Ligand binder design. Structure first.
Ligand SMILES: OC[C@H]1O[C@@H](O[C@H]2[C@H](O)[C@@H](O)[C@H](O)O[C@@H]2CO)[C@H](O)[C@@H](O)[C@H]1O
Ligand code: NA
Ligand code: NI
Length: 149
């Protein structure tokens, strides 16, 4: 890390907020918090705007789910239609456990690590320059949101 500057502490979920700079290659988004014991799922959405009707495009939907053995669904929403799901079954998330999510923006893809260990990759389907909004929804508690540009 270093260069990480945390804004937003303990936001009310759902949280929707504008990202303070363009997500150029090398940028980090760092989200710390924990999963409550009654959690079915939560999501971190990198969005093109904050429109609700029509629902803003989600360039990167990062969606841990905890039913059964749990997983992480990643996907992209365009014109309120979901695309092809990229499912990661080796999920490090567990109910009643803390996490640090680090999303690293590369030229061709996102690289995501959780609690210091690599978790997944997701190739860009929308140009990252169109991402200006971070949403966090569902059953999750967030201590901090920060960025490293
Ligand atoms: O793709 C993310 C999107 O998934 C929706 O649910 C899917 C589900 O993940 C898939 O495995 C199942 O087979 O069909 C559903 C069809 O939409 C969620 O409703 C949505 O919240 C997004 O998370
Ligand atoms: Na959704
Ligand atoms: Ni805590």
């Amino acid at each position: 890390l270093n260069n990480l500057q945390n804004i937003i502490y303990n936001p009310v979920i759902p949280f929707v907020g504008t990202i303070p700079d363009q997500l150029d290659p090398g940028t980090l988004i760092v989200i710390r918090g924990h999963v409550p014991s009654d959690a079915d799922r939560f999501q971190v959405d990198l969005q093109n705007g904050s429109s609700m009707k029509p629902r803003a495009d989600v360039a990167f939907h990062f969606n841990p789910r905890f039913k059964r053995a749990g997983c992480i669904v990643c996907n992209t929403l365009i014109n309120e239609k979901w695309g092809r799901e990229e499912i990661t079954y080796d999920t490090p998330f567990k109910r009643e456990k803390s996490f640090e999510i680090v999303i690293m923006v590369l030229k061709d893809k996102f690289q995501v690590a959780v609690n210091g260990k690599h978790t997944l990759l997701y190739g860009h389907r929308i140009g990252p320059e169109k991402i200006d909004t971070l949403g966090i929804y569902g059953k999750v508690n967030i201590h901090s949101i920060g960025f490293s540009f």
